[PDB]
């Protein structure tokens, strides 16, 4: 600190929201990026995009790690994505709703969606802490019939994945292009099977997306200080795309299932 | 990017001189997984019996096979030597690292011990949601028989006991799913429809009896040359090999 | 502090002094700057200036500011500008004297005065503590009807300031134009009314100079940590001109009049 | 420059459209305070009788009017409902946040209820060092009869009953000082010649008698064209007019 | 801090070793470097030169200084150079021997040596400690009938020295380059007199490297801050010339008198 | 380079106007050290009696005089005042900054109260290992004869009772030690032949008796024209001349 104003803070952006970083990021992206070109081969009707509601960056969860609970590998974050996200506007009953956040508000009256994700963990420590955490991401990580052993620490740091340095205090942003079994994914649950058939579909279950304590988060033995972190999240879409226009009502959205 | 991230080097001698990939040393390469892929390994082998077959035979198939590029469930058994100490071979140890996939596989079905005839169809819109296979008797009728119009090939065995096809992709999706569990209700569509290359079933065409020591059925398996191992994810974690049979008794 | 000196420290010259500060500063102009036409018409007399005396940044007070008498609007300074300031050599009777400070020589011999000033403040904190000081300054704010009102330091902020932050460790500087009633200040008391008249000036009172607390000040709960920070001031004349050669002893100065 | 300083900007939106200060919409431009300070607005106004004059009126000095351009020091009363729910008008609070100016006055004054003659001087040279008017007979002699050689206006109530003049800058120094203090005595001359314009005078010059309602003078005022709001410092601290007479009683 | 990883570091290498810095160094030369041209005058043998095993930076020894043991002008190091450097390796009995470190491989085989020397003195301390250390050398100084009077810091200060500032953790180099008697300095203990003649002469003794107290480390009061911080140095040679090529025990090393 | 290093200067004023190092108010410069080391200084002085001498004397030595360019290690006593109160002179003190040197040396030898013949010889291959002289009857035999082929002057007193040589530079090394100890016997080799320019021995030549008075030999010194001073390390801590006799008696 050598100004008035403490120094500067870099900024960043999109649609009518504004972000302020201060330290150099931690980056990565899911996979190789790309212009889709078969999802034109899937519907028919035109598809709507919304760039100004979905482009925007949003907030997703606030998490708090103690010291107490801070373990190798230890889970803040273990969530379905993008489909925790999307569905994080909940009722009395845990059902979600897509009708009052604007970035989710397409997914209300469309039956099929695609896009590319951006995720950011912020961590705001104090000077005087040390600890680290990875961010990481699983393509449909939940339907392979070794996930859980996937959730250890050295096989995160396998898969796409950033780092946060709570001793530099760095912002982190991991890139996750679109890759799907399909060319789009479903917004609810519609098309479950009948008597005879069984095709269940998870709505928006692109991935994992996981976040776990590197090195366990220590502080100074002192009464006074701080033995807890906020881990905060924040994503946002590139190419959204939505199609199969349909009434806010025509299909329901269940209490979403967790993972172990 | 994190993964291949490397700041702050300290390197204390210059780089090791290339053979590229082993042709200076060897007279070939080996730079790719795909490559070795391509080398054949086992998928499933077993012995059938009389006993295992319906009671009349009338022509019904012999073994129902899922198609899986990762390969089946192995299961180490005192009758299994093979899957007990050499486990599961490179194909599903290079598949693992990897989330999706799209091409088709190649396969070679060896037939011992039966004198009659082998019909082998593959049922691309007909993939198992399980990743075990199914013997004889225990097939369902609508795979127990020969299906029309289906892609198949008739071989006596008479002329050559080896069949050798190629299994090709026909999925309505942009991936088949790799490293796929058999536990999956969430997303069953996936699992039944976007996962496994369809059922190849191999039967018997003959009235010939089957011997006493029976017949064994051993398919091999290796990629196509249209496929491809797309996106990489971690590693799961491992066994080793040498700690299924110990070299505490080094021969045995 | 990355060398074996400390770091580099830029440095600030005039006559025969030389300042050091190390940060960046907060900078602000009382008024517009331009150059005096009509102090021409004032005096026929040959305006003398003494710029390697004048033009000198000479060290004006030091004042003690505790955690215990540090609340919001606190003045730390409260001071008639340039008067103070010029006459801050005073005897055993609290009277002023010109002769000492060779800044300062000139005002004794001379009975009209004008110049441009600049005011320093020089704060050195550890890394530790946090607060804020405002440095204001009011043109003749003395004589307006609701001067009292103004020393809120919510109307400091509208007056021409400038801003340390105790927690960056910030120089800054204050430049103040001359603007008066009259294109010349009385350097000591003179031309005092009679029986019947009362034309009564007070000498060198341009304006008033505050220095109030935006923020109190900070400090760990620790036994050995510093619960005190001295701010220091230096000021210095930039267009000193001085006319009406008199004898230094021709008018006398009395014991200046505070403020409430 | 802190005053404007504007650090580490975060802007989601980009800036409104101009509409050139109500030009685009209204007819008229809204950019400068110097233009509403060309408003005219109530200087001071006050009734007077008989009883306030001489005894004997020998074409004395109706009122005493010192030349503030922020006005005089107000008196809310029962007797005086605008100053004590309107306040001070705009130019006063104009005035508030600056130090300094150097322009002239435009005046109007409003004689009614007397049918006789009305001169008015201006003595640049006597300005008063108190905030308030001076009435009738308290105005001494050396202000209370028409002195010679200053710039007048002798005006008939017969043909008109508004005076129109405009009062100019005759001060000896640069500035003069606005907002000061009456209590005043470390700086008796600045407040006594650079502070306000010269007291202007208003009186009668006739025999006809005053009505028992009396006469009523309304003096308004504004700034000249040649007037400058010079240095700006801060506001001071304000009052708000809809905190005299509450909304608790809508109509009263 | 502002990165995942910590920040640049510098980097230095030389042979088949890499060090690291993260700071601006202190610098100083012992004397005006040059190409030697009357060595080739001293022996008829060509001169063998062994770069990659002599240009390599090694490591020295680690000395500790708490603050219970630093006083103004107390020695942490006071060595003969480079004779206690390339004698560093003993025995049970505290006899060197050059067979076992590659840089001091060419020594056992050779009677007569010469080259340039370069010292790092590298110091971690934490960010809250303070002292200063001065590293000096002074030319064949122990055969000067006032050396004991010239260890004093006060004379340290005007020898050809470098600074270590505690509180900015620099690092230091000081250059060396070689001034002797003679064209080569001795190996080994080696043509010693006999009856009548006393012609005895040291080892590799060029001169003597100071380590010491410029200003006493202090530390916090606290229990837990470090009272003790180590002092690691480094050698290296530029010119290494070797000649007189003989059996590795033709001549002994003698256990090695040490200074006052 | 930390000996010059001058980080963050703050200098009030301008440098001062140059002198070119007093040459413009006096008529000289005064720039280097190897100037004022050529100014002769006294080396060594003594008085040498009958007694001091062998009992026969064949014409042997009367002092053997080691060469030091930092001069002898000096005896203040009661007999020799110089010595107590002016301590060394300004070459030793010179000398006393600096490692090594390469050059010779000039001297002057002054022998009052002698009437006979005076031989000097240079030893060059011969230096004392002792920062003191020897004289007299406690010069060894190989020292207190004339030797030969070694380079010599042969003065008469009666012609000039001052003798003035310059002693060469012949030593095997590059350089030769300043500031050598007395006590060393770690390297007695440099202290031997690498210190001193070799001893040089002032004899007599005559059968003409010593008054009882004595003889008085003065030897001045300083550096010759192919000197260097060459290694800059310190300066040794020194001690004041005005602390030897007080001005507490401001005359004694």
Chains 1, 3, 5 share one sequence.
């Not at chain 1, 035109?46 to 107490?68: A, G």
């Not at chain 1, 996937?150 to 760095?170: D, F, I």
């Not at chain 1, 924040?234 to 009502?249: C, E, I, L, Y």
């Amino acid at each position: 600190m050598d100004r008035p104003e403490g120094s500067e803070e870099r900024t960043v952006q999109t649609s009518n929201v504004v972000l302020g970083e201060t330290n150099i990021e931690s980056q990565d992206i899911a996979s190789k990026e790309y212009s889709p070109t078969w999802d034109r081969l899937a519907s028919s009707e035109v598809s709507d995009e919304y760039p100004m509601l979905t482009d925007r960056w949003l907030f997703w969860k606030s998490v708090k790690w103690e010291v107490n609970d801070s373990a190798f590998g230890k889970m803040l974050v273990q969530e379905k994505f993008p489909q925790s996200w999307v569905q994080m506007d909940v009722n009395v009953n845990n059902i979600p709703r897509y009708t009052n956040i604007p970035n989710f508000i397409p997914f209300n009256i469309h039956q099929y969606m695609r896009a590319d994700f951006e995720v950011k963990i912020y961590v705001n420590p104090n000077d005087f802490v040390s600890g680290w955490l990875i961010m990481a991401f699983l393509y449909q990580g939940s339907e392979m019939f070794d996930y859980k052993l996937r959730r250890n620490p050295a096989a995160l740091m396998q898969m796409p994945h950033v780092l946060v340095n709570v001793g530099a205090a760095n912002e982190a942003t991991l890139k996750i292009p679109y890759r799907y079994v399909r060319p789009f994914m479903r917004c609810k649950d519609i098309l479950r099977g009948d008597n005879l058939i069984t095709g269940v579909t998870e709505p928006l279950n692109m991935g994992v997306l996981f976040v776990e304590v590197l090195i366990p988060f220590r502080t100074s033995a002192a009464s006074s200080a701080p033995k807890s972190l906020d881990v905060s999240l924040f994503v946002k879409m590139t190419n959204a795309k939505f199609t199969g226009m349909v009434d806010g009502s025509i299909a329901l959205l269940s209490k979403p299932i967790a993972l172990p | 990017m994190e993964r291949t991230f490397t700041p702050n080097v300290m390197q204390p001698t210059p780089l090791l001189p290339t053979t590229n990939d082993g042709r200076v040393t060897f007279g070939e390469a080996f730079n790719d997984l795909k490559d070795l892929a391509r080398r054949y390994q086992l998928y499933w082998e077993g012995t059938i019996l009389e006993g295992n077959l319906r009671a009349i035979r009338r022509n019904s198939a012999l073994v129902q096979l899922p198609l899986y590029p990762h390969g089946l469930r192995i299961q180490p058994d005192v009758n299994n030597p093979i899957w007990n100490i050499m486990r599961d071979g490179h194909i599903p140890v290079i598949s693992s690292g990897f989330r999706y996939f799209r091409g088709g596989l190649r396969l070679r079905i060896v037939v011992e011990g039966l004198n009659s005839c082998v019909w082998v169809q593959h049922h691309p819109d007909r993939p198992s949601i399980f990743s075990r296979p199914i013997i004889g008797r225990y097939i369902a009728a609508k795979d127990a028989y020969r299906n029309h119009a289906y892609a198949a090939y008739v071989q006596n065995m008479s002329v050559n006991r080896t069949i050798e096809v190629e299994v090709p992709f026909y999925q309505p999706g942009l991936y088949g799913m790799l490293n796929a569990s058999d536990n999956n209700t969430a997303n069953s569509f996936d699992r039944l429809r976007f996962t496994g290359l369809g059922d190849l079933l191999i039967g018997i065409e003959g009235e010939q009896p089957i011997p006493k020591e029976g017949i064994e059925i051993s398919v091999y398996y290796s990629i196509a040359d249209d496929f491809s191992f797309n996106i990489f994810c971690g590693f799961p974690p491992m066994v080793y090999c040498d700690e299924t049979y110990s070299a505490a008794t080094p021969d045995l």
